[PDB]
Design a protein around this ligand. Structure first.
Ligand SMILES: CCC(=O)SCCNC(=O)CCNC(=O)[C@H](O)C(C)(C)COP(=O)(O)OP(=O)(O)OC[C@H]1O[C@@H](n2cnc3c(N)ncnc32)[C@H](O)[C@@H]1OP(=O)(O)O
Ligand SMILES: CCC(=O)SCCNC(=O)CCNC(=O)[C@H](O)C(C)(C)COP(=O)(O)OP(=O)(O)OC[C@H]1O[C@@H](n2cnc3c(N)ncnc32)[C@H](O)[C@@H]1OP(=O)(O)O
Ligand SMILES: CCC(=O)SCCNC(=O)CCNC(=O)[C@H](O)C(C)(C)COP(=O)(O)OP(=O)(O)OC[C@H]1O[C@@H](n2cnc3c(N)ncnc32)[C@H](O)[C@@H]1OP(=O)(O)O
Ligand SMILES: *C(=O)CCCC[C@@H]1SC[C@@H]2NC(=O)N[C@@H]21
Ligand SMILES: *C(=O)CCCC[C@@H]1SC[C@@H]2NC(=O)N[C@@H]21
Ligand SMILES: *C(=O)CCCC[C@@H]1SC[C@@H]2NC(=O)N[C@@H]21
Lengths: 210, 541, 541, 541
């Protein structure tokens, strides 16, 4: 079965993600007119205070919160649950592969860093660990109303039915223009409010989900 | 060509000298005090209001700015010390508001975030002062402005000091109306509840964002409706996000929660069609050859002893290189050419009292910097302006007036940094606050008053001795000490960096070492605007 | 053609009605009180300091302005009521300074005269506020500026409130440096003794004048020389007129006495090569058909009763003619076209609360006035902004925001006059102080606050009744009266014309009748500048 | 930064649904019909005239444009369907002329080639219409213009419709005279025989090319010389290439044959000193995530059923990303921000009748696009403008007028595409032909008329029923059918894409799939000109 990641492995995943974001920043700068300028160094240098980034990584089924403090010398202090790790490292290339060079609490290591859509792959000489980046709700979300004031030609569904998203619920004609309603939502219909041949108005609810 | 070798500034200081140890210890004490004070100001309104802020699903405002800017980007906060002991029993951290410059989607944006944990996000007069300062920073530098609206409205007991004047609260909407006519994009993100005067801040935006079940806009609150009409209405039924996105049309984007609103903000900024163009010339950057804990040791805390300002310019420029202009004529002013982070800088600094030769050298250097379109960095360490009968006979007044005219007419991005004292009309000549620099930071040892405490105490002692000797009474040593303690005490208290930075007289007490990085950040924002041609007035010859 | 006949405004009021008698009596009482207060402010620092001012051969400052301007010319004083009960035991008449607009050698000049009879001519913070207001009036309107220097310097106990900020004393020299780069001529007449910060006011002038045995300029006084050096020197030996005209070269003309200095000032102004050019169109002037003691009877003192604003526009325009624009749609705002003294004016006035139809009508009219380059006169009589659930559902916020954006982006010469109340954000929509009008005068019945006293008292009464009913304690009538007396008292005291005009929030309480003449004078100065093209921002549709 | 992830549009349609099969089959039938019609138009004047064109050593005109442009370059032909059944028995393929945009020596040039195989290359009135359209496309977009002159002259029987008016034939020379004053280079290549009015087309060129024994220029032909004088002269002896290159001086380069003339044309274009500068910002390009045979299935042929316009915007933009502006307020108009081929586009599309909220949203979005200098792509699928008594009471007229004013005052490169119906005054609001877009293409299912056929038939049926019931006669079903068949028939015939594109009312019926590529090509040519600042008129609030 799959085994849980060690806290040091989560530090490596967090560091690889941070350095990948830096890489994107660096390749943006290479195309900029304003070259050599500050803001291009992903140092997290706040004025008079420190910056702590709170990120969450998903280890299998469970979420782990990692608080990453940006240190003045380029190191990171990553606190995972309670334990603080001193995390340093960088990226280097050998041919067409990218490697992540780490030092965590004085322990040096090297692993291949591949980030594909959401999953962070770390390939080392002791195994292979897959850490997932959680996807926020507003990127994964993708009842209905009447478009105008018209008469309904054909109903489709009743209570007790089930439709899946992108389904015909109703067709209504409003000043000679056939409008087929569809479902952005999902589930099971609890009530259909307008039977076929009745007059529905503008922004009037047609069906309902309980 | 750009290849030949050039001598550099800098002297390795005597690290074993007891003057170095005492200066280093006292400046380190000042910087540690600064550190612990800003770590107390960072928490905001305290743990009770932070619990009631996170119990409603709201991100805390520093977390909002952390999730808004590019990942790993440095944030330049402005005026972190506003409202510090400015009101009697009212502790207002940060003024109630968090303003700074950050990097959003590759664009340097100016961010204005209402901290709602401190007194409900209500507007104090210092909050309005800090906000209008941020908005003219955005207008001078052409920075797109982002507001994170979560206010409460003016602060009624103080309503006079907030409402009617020219630079009171309504000026804010003036600043959004003018900046929209100049293609400086204004985004408002309604994360809270702007009410009845603050509802113009989302309504005058070029592109707006609102949050469901959390963000309310109305010109009249439910107390005002229940008093004037008698109709009970809630907040979300009156001015909620569904009502404004769907029926009224005030909001332009709709957001599920706070993270969605900041994501949508980054989208709106990415589609602004803005491309940064530098008109100055850039060289590949370098580093100073001397560290800045040496600036702790060099500069120190006592203002009686002088130092060399060149040992500061060795510590903050690229390569420690410095082309000194007119180096022997009037060496109480040090003017030269350097580079910070690639940008060409004309550096003007002090070394003593200002003779007339120093003012002539300063006027010549400011004219060179405006003819070649080079920015100017002024470093203030002023005692005064060289008293004497002979010097007033020479016309020392018209030479200081020439420096003031050339400094005030200059169109290049000027940045002032007060590394020591800043007293009297020399403060006007070296581009103080009233002469519109881009940014004005101070060090934690600085003093700024109309004169020194000893000058005021001693001229008042001599004048009162002169009038009593015309009178005849005995003016003893104890009468002189009772005359000299409250003048010194008042000019010491009200000349502090914390007294000056509790208002928005300066853009923030900065660490000496961080000085280098801070100047680079400042200059980067100031190069977001094209440089206009300078035309001076009449030089009083 | 311009010959056909046109109907006119105006209704003859019921002069026998007891409402007219009571309104007339109460407004006459206000105007008589204004008269006696300004006759006390006119004397200045009192007879002792006036005797010691005339014992040195010096003209008194009002006599200086009387001998400076053209013979018989009207002088428009600005902010006569500054410093009125603004400091605790310190009575500062006129702020210490006399600023106004006059006609010198045929040119409208702006005159700034240091009254030396009031506290030695020392600069109070309100003196600096009044002076910087005068200087931006001169810069907006392109008026040549004349200073009659007879100061004493900052006021040390208040030195913080005078020295460091952006709009503190040093801004003055910024304003003379920028205005000299724009060909706005600056003349300083040293009639007194500017000292050590004020000596930049003569030194930064394009052409200077000094008086023998009476006028001293130095950057350092004889106390400072006697303290720093130990050399006893007088005032005339150190910085006298002979030393400055002959050796140092600070002064450009030399004057025997005060009359010679004012004569030389008129010569310097005559040789400025300035020729006034109007870009607006002028018609031959006329008169109102109704007198303005009728404005005493119409308007009165109570703000509860409304009146018609058209009966004001019949009393102040030429011929009582008024082309009313969009007269039925939203008649709580009255917008039309008239002429004062030949100048074309677009008149915007209030008649009640501001519905959304009123804001749309206002935005349309301001766009017409900027499209045709016509000046704008705003008349403020505001209660509020029409509370209700339906009106917030309609988007009343975005309509007020459209009026604020079009008012703030407008480049025509705008003049505000507050003929009644001016409360809240409607004050921002009708071009209050923060939106940069040219001039802003008020009538002696006006009130200006963030809300009315009754609004604040009643919403606080209803909110505290709401929270006690959630609590459970008894909130009686006597608790409500003890809740309602200090709110009403504070908003009545701090909403006064004398409280608002003790600061420089407004350019002066004017008589109602004199209103007509005053507006003409104001508009004449505002037409000394060419009119720029207006470009608005984004209209929130 | 530009690195974070963003949601995208698009829904995978139900490919098994019988609505999809029927819509796909009917749109595929329309596109195949378009294909075979343009393959018949491509051959030109037929094989007899093509044999007599190649027997004189002349390249055919499509081979001329194939050898003129860069190798492998896409050619964008404009108005391929002009003259389609426009004259009774006269079949005029392509109008007689071949106009388009191509890439010559790295420069986007506009090419105008006289097809001499169709009626001797004579000018029909539609040929003049097509040519003047091409020339204003070259002037709007600053494209250098190349003419391949091989005409015959006006078409005498139609001489009125060709000669005198403003936009008749002589306007051509006006267009070459104005464009030469603006540095838009005009090259004429005389490959044929321009005669007596067309001889101004080579003579007004900035640099000319002629072909020996093949190219003749004269202001008077040998019939006119033989009639007026009686001197027999040939064509080559009168106006040949040797006479014009050597004695008269009309031609500037001399060419052996057709390939030499096209080679010399490419040389002349290479030495124009033109360097393209983009002022917009570019991102690295991408692809849509959904194919466009899905646009066949989605859109279909019936105009009764609606579809979602967002499923079109998923199919034509880069990455299928689309920042939707004001997504809930008035969702009968879809406005958002996208990118095509790197270029930033502001996309405005329809979803139904236009309420007043839709017009306000449209006015706001067009102001944003002109404020940020972003191009605009309008997608037209209009039924009408929401009839009703309440909506006329609301002022639906002034909101449509605001959208028309902001669309007509806009200076950004606008491109219209009519993806469905386009009826009535909504056609004016969504930037139809009379509002000067850069390019206006249509799809083969579009309809364009002053109203729909059913609207005209039904309002005429109800009006005639109303007047007969005032009269008294019987208006039966058969009288109604005889009333409704010719109105429907006429509005169906004259609303076609082929009827609209037989004239130059649109720049060409395009395939749906090719739509994506075509828009990119169009926008590339439209970015050859710098973008001017937009200033709007008066917004009727
Ligand atoms: C008509 C022209 C204008 O626009 S002038 C309008 C003047 N402004 C107002 O009165 C708006 C009222 N402010 C508010 O938001 C209300 O107090 C409500 C909605 C009840 C605030 O709810 P809640 O989120 O629970 O408040 P909070 O915990 O953030 O309050 C923090 C503390 O500050 C206070 N506060 C807040 N706003 C004002 C204000 N405008 N004037 C005076 N005090 C204010 C609150 O009472 C609260 O006191 P405390 O710190 O909890 O003891
Ligand atoms: C470089 C920074 C700047 O530019 S601000 C520097 C601050 N200014 C000064 O201290 C200048 C000193 N002012 C003066 O003119 C001196 O007091 C002298 C020359 C003695 C005035 O002489 P005399 O003409 O007799 O005085 P006066 O009768 O006009 O004085 C009126 C009353 O006001 C007082 N006063 C005047 N100036 C100041 C001042 N700057 N700070 C504080 N008080 C001031 C005078 O003492 C005098 O008091 P009283 O009303 O007579 O009881
Ligand atoms: C003073 C202002 C002006 O410029 S008004 C002058 C009007 N223009 C003219 O009449 C020019 C005469 N056009 C021609 O080129 C002559 O017809 C000549 C030189 C004989 C054409 O020779 P060729 O090359 O053999 O002719 P083609 O085979 O290309 O002719 C094609 C068919 O079209 C006809 N055509 C041509 N031009 C005109 C014209 N302007 N008006 C009327 N018909 C014209 C030709 O007659 C010929 O007819 P068909 O198709 O062969 O049956
Ligand atoms: C002693 O107590 C200080 C006396 C005056 C201060 C000195 S004198 C020279 C410097 N210039 C100036 O105006 N003040 C400084
Ligand atoms: C009574 O005490 C006053 C209640 C509120 C004041 C009225 S309600 C309508 C006007 N608009 C506004 O905002 N205040 C005024
Ligand atoms: C039926 O034959 C059509 C009647 C009118 C056409 C409809 S009504 C609403 C749409 N708007 C418009 O002006 N015409 C369309």
């Amino acid at each position: 079965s799959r085994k849980a990641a060690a806290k040091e492995s989560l530090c490596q995943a967090a560091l690889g993600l941070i350095l990948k974001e830096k890489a994107m920043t660096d390749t943006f700068t290479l195309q900029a007119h304003d070259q050599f300028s500050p803001f291009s160094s992903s140092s997290g240098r706040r004025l008079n205070i420190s910056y702590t980034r709170n990120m969450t990584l998903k280890d299998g089924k469970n979420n782990v919160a990692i608080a990453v403090t940006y240190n003045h010398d380029g190191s990171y202090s990553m606190q995972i649950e309670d334990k603080t790790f001193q995390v340093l490292g960088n990226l280097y290339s050998e041919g067409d592969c990218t490697y992540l060079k780490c030092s965590v609490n004085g322990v040096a290591s090297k692993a291949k860093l591949i980030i594909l859509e959401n999953t962070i792959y770390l390939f080392s000489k002791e195994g292979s660990i897959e850490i997932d980046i959680p996807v926020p709700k507003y990127l994964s979300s993708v009842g209905p109303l009447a478009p105008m004031t018209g008469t309904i030609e054909k109903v489709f569904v009743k209570a007790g039915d089930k439709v899946k998203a992108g389904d015909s619920l109703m067709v209504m004609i409003a000043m000679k223009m056939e409008h087929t309603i569809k479902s952005p939502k999902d589930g099971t219909v609890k009530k259909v409010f307008y039977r076929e041949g009745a007059q529905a108005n503008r922004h009037t609810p047609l069906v309902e989900f309980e | 060509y750009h290849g030949d070798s050039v001598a550099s500034l800098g002297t390795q200081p005597d690290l074993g000298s007891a003057l170095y140890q005492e200066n280093y210890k006292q400046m380190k004490a000042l910087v540690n005090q600064l550190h612990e004070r800003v770590e107390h100001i960072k928490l905001g309104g305290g743990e009770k209001a932070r619990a009631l802020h996170i119990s409603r699903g709201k991100l805390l405002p520093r977390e909002r700015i952390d999730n808004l800017i590019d990942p790993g980007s440095p944030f330049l906060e402005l005026s972190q010390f506003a409202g510090y002991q400015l009101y009697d029993n009212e502790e207002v951290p940060g003024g109630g508001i968090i303003t700074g410059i950050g990097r959003v989607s590759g664009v340097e944006c100016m961010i204005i975030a209402n901290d709602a944990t401190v007194k409900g996000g209500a507007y104090y007069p210092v909050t309005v002062k800090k906000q209008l300062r941020a908005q003219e920073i955005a207008m001078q530098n052409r920075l797109p402005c982002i507001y994170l609206v979560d206010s409460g409205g003016a602060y009624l007991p103080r309503q006079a000091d907030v409402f009617p004047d020219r630079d009171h609260f309504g000026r804010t909407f003036y600043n959004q109306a003018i900046m929209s006519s100049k293609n400086i994009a204004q985004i408002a993100v309604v994360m809270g509840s702007c009410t009845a005067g603050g509802a113009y801040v989302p309504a005058m935006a070029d592109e707006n964002i609102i949050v469901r079940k959390q963000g309310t806009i109305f010109l009249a609150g439910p107390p005002l409706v229940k008093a004037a009409t008698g109709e009970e209405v809630s907040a979300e039924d009156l001015g909620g996000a569904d009502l404004h996105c769907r029926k009224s049309g005030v909001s332009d984007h709709w957001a599920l929660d706070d993270h969605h609103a900041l994501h949508l903000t980054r989208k709106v900024v990415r589609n602004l069609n803005y491309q940064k163009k530098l008109d100055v010339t850039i060289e590949p950057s370098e580093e100073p050859l001397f560290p800045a804990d040496e600036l702790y040791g060099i500069v120190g805390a006592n203002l009686k002893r002088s130092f060399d300002v060149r040992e500061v310019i060795a510590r903050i420029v690229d390569g420690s290189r410095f082309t000194e202009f007119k180096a022997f004529y009037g060496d109480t002013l040090v003017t030269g050419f350097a580079r910070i982070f690639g940008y060409p800088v004309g550096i003007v600094g002090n070394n003593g009292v200002l003779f007339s030769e120093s003012a002539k050298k300063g006027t010549h250097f400011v004219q060179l910097c405006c003819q070649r379109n080079i920015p100017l960095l002024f470093l203030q360490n002023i005692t005064g302006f060289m008293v004497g009968r002979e010097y007033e006979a020479e016309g020392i007044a018209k030479d200081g007036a020439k420096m003031v005219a050339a400094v005030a007419c200059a169109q290049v991005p000027k940045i002032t940094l007060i590394i020591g004292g800043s007293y009297g009309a020399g403060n006007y000549g070296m581009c103080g606050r009233a002469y519109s620099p881009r940014f004005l930071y101070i060090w934690p040892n600085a003093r700024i008053s109309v004169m020194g405490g000893e000058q005021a105490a001693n001229v008042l002692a001599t004048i009162t001795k002169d009038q009593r000797a015309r009178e005849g009474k005995q003016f003893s040593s104890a009468d002189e000490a009772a005359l000299k303690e409250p003048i010194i005490k008042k000019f010491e208290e009200e000349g502090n960096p914390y007294y000056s930075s509790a208002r928005v007289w300066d853009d923030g007490i900065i660490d000496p070492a961080d000085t280098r990085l801070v100047l680079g950040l400042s200059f980067s924002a100031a190069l977001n605007a094209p440089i206009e041609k300078t035309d001076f007035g009449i030089f009083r010859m």
